[PDB]
């Protein structure tokens, strides 16, 4: 499958994956593309924050899905 990832400015990123792929796996791929560490990543698919222990199938995230990438800020 091929999913898209919209950045803040607008820069989109296309990544090839499968419904089984784990969110954590996707975040890792993005980290290999840009330079944002996982802990500093957050995937949101329309008012839906994806967990790091789930699969692109646990959200019905089909193909050509635009994933909003947000820089996970610190906290505690």
């Amino acid at each position: 499958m091929q999913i898209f990832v919209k950045t803040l400015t607008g820069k989109t990123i296309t990544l090839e994956v499968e419904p089984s792929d784990t969110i954590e796996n996707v975040k890792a791929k993005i980290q290999d593309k840009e330079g944002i560490p996982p802990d500093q990543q957050r995937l949101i698919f329309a008012g839906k924050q994806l967990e790091d222990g789930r699969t692109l199938s646990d959200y019905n995230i089909q193909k050509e899905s635009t994933l909003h990438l947000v820089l996970r800020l610190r906290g505690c």
Binding site: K6, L8, R42, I44, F45, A46, G47, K48, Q49, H68, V70, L71, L73, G75
Partner: protein, 43 residues
């Protein structure tokens, strides 16, 4: 820079939660920018 929101009265939980609960790219951008500024600057 055009038509923005005044996030000069938000809280840590608001921004963090809003970003973790919301998905409004616009807000996300303004939320992150204000979050950083607060850390970088102080006025």
């Amino acid at each position: 820079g055009t038509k923005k929101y005044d996030l000069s009265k938000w809280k840590y939980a608001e921004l963090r939660d809003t970003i973790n609960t919301s998905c409004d790219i616009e807000l996300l951008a303004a939320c992150r920018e204000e979050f950083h500024r607060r850390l970088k600057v102080y006025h």
